[PDB]
Design an enzyme around this catalytic site. Structure first.
Site, PDB file in Angstrom:
ATOM      1  N   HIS A  45      39.939  14.104   4.741  1.00 24.80           N
ATOM      2  CA  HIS A  45      38.830  14.099   5.685  1.00 24.80           C
ATOM      3  C   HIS A  45      39.184  13.360   6.956  1.00 24.80           C
ATOM      4  O   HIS A  45      38.570  13.571   7.988  1.00 24.80           O
ATOM      5  CB  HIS A  45      37.551  13.595   5.022  1.00 24.80           C
ATOM      6  CG  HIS A  45      37.387  12.100   4.999  1.00 24.80           C
ATOM      7  ND1 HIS A  45      37.491  11.332   3.852  1.00 24.80           N
ATOM      8  CD2 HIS A  45      37.052  11.245   5.994  1.00 24.80           C
ATOM      9  CE1 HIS A  45      37.229  10.074   4.142  1.00 24.80           C
ATOM     10  NE2 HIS A  45      36.973   9.994   5.440  1.00 24.80           N
ATOM     11  N   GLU A  69      55.246  -3.961  15.009  1.00 21.74           N
ATOM     12  CA  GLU A  69      54.746  -2.599  14.923  1.00 21.74           C
ATOM     13  C   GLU A  69      55.846  -1.577  15.217  1.00 21.74           C
ATOM     14  O   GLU A  69      56.684  -1.782  16.082  1.00 21.74           O
ATOM     15  CB  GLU A  69      53.615  -2.365  15.924  1.00 21.74           C
ATOM     16  CG  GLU A  69      52.433  -3.351  15.791  1.00 21.74           C
ATOM     17  CD  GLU A  69      52.509  -4.566  16.698  1.00 21.74           C
ATOM     18  OE1 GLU A  69      53.621  -5.087  16.929  1.00 21.74           O
ATOM     19  OE2 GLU A  69      51.425  -5.010  17.161  1.00 21.74           O
ATOM     20  N   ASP A  93      40.475  14.945  -1.785  1.00 17.94           N
ATOM     21  CA  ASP A  93      40.482  14.248  -0.492  1.00 17.94           C
ATOM     22  C   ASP A  93      41.811  13.522  -0.304  1.00 17.94           C
ATOM     23  O   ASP A  93      41.914  12.305  -0.460  1.00 17.94           O
ATOM     24  CB  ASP A  93      39.304  13.306  -0.356  1.00 17.94           C
ATOM     25  CG  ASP A  93      39.041  12.875   1.107  1.00 17.94           C
ATOM     26  OD1 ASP A  93      38.129  12.031   1.290  1.00 17.94           O
ATOM     27  OD2 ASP A  93      39.751  13.362   2.002  1.00 17.94           O
ATOM     28  N   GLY A 186      36.317   3.713   8.458  1.00 18.97           N
ATOM     29  CA  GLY A 186      37.575   3.264   9.014  1.00 18.97           C
ATOM     30  C   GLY A 186      38.570   2.763   7.990  1.00 18.97           C
ATOM     31  O   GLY A 186      39.752   2.601   8.310  1.00 18.97           O
ATOM     32  N   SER A 188      38.857   4.646   5.115  1.00 18.09           N
ATOM     33  CA  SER A 188      39.223   5.905   4.471  1.00 18.09           C
ATOM     34  C   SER A 188      40.673   6.194   4.683  1.00 18.09           C
ATOM     35  O   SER A 188      41.224   5.933   5.759  1.00 18.09           O
ATOM     36  CB  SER A 188      38.411   7.053   5.020  1.00 18.09           C
ATOM     37  OG  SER A 188      37.052   6.928   4.632  1.00 18.09           O
ATOM     38  N   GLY A 189      41.286   6.767   3.658  1.00 12.57           N
ATOM     39  CA  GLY A 189      42.686   7.143   3.732  1.00 12.57           C
ATOM     40  C   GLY A 189      43.637   6.045   3.310  1.00 12.57           C
ATOM     41  O   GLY A 189      44.788   6.352   2.977  1.00 12.57           O
TER      42      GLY A 189
END
Ligand code: NA
Length: 240
Positions: A45, A69, A93, A186, A188-189
């Site tokens: 998603h 980074e 998902d 935020g 999610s994943g």
């Protein structure tokens, strides 16, 4: 993450920030887990929208230079073929992102280890969610990576009527539900890291929370169960 604490910057080196291009800048939208030097595991998603995505590994503070980074473009997106964006409750998902470059590994950038296929955690197993998601329902993103301790809630409990009922499937992991600590938008994943035989492994990909709020008692955060998708993941990587 609601009710989290700031993570140490080398605790969760497989966590990534998935960002999209927004004007002249980049905006964090989701988490992910680095699983190969050039592959990230995230939620389907998170990549429904037709956006330009990048991944940041070695990220700690979204809003400051960490000195660690690496920024890399997303070259290919492979969403699970059964995913349906208007039916998150069906599951599936999960998506894999092939990065344009292979990242360099160090104490801030490591591959996430995945569970063996079929592994199901006992109820109340120790796990942490991590992410930069909202720190309150209807709040704002964290600046610094957060962690929260979220014990698993097994399928029998999680699919009971006062929890998630029919909406939770066996292809998911539930964790938390204490009304204080949770994933939030935020996150999610990103990973759910669970300690098993002395080693953390990424057992979940954050998928959803209650429409009524992030930290809602008896609505634990729901994750795609990584151990249900080992063959799928390996098949995608081998064919790409
Ligand atoms: Na940073």
């Amino acid at each position: 993450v609601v009710g989290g604490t700031e993570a140490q910057r080398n605790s969760w080196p497989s966590q990534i920030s998935l960002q999209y291009r927004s004007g002249s800048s980049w905006a964090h939208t989701c988490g992910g887990t680095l699983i190969r030097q050039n592959w990230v595991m995230t939620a389907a998603h998170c990549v429904d929208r037709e956006l330009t995505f990048r991944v940041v590994v070695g990220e700690h503070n979204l809003n400051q230079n960490n000195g660690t980074e690496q920024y890399v473009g997303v070259q290919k997106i492979v969403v699970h073929p059964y995913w349906n964006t208007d039916d998150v409750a069906a599951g599936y998902d999960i998506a894999l992102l092939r990065l344009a470059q292979s990242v360099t590994l160090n104490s801030y950038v490591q591959l996430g280890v995945l569970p063996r296929a079929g592994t199901i955690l006992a109820n109340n197993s120790p796990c942490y969610i991590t992410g930069w998601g909202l720190t309150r329902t209807n709040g704002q993103l964290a600046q610094t990576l957060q962690q929260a301790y979220l014990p698993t809630v097994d399928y029998a409990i999680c699919s009971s009527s006062s929890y998630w009922g029919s909406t939770v499937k066996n292809s998911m992991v539930c964790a938390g539900g204490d009304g204080v600590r949770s994933g939030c938008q935020g996150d999610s994943g990103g990973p759910l890291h669970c300690l098993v035989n002395g080693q953390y492994a990424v057992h979940g990909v954050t998928s959803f929370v209650s429409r009524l709020g992030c930290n809602v008692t008896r609505k634990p955060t729901v994750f795609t169960r990584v151990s249900a998708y080992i063959s799928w993941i390996n098949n995608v990587i081998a064919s790409n």
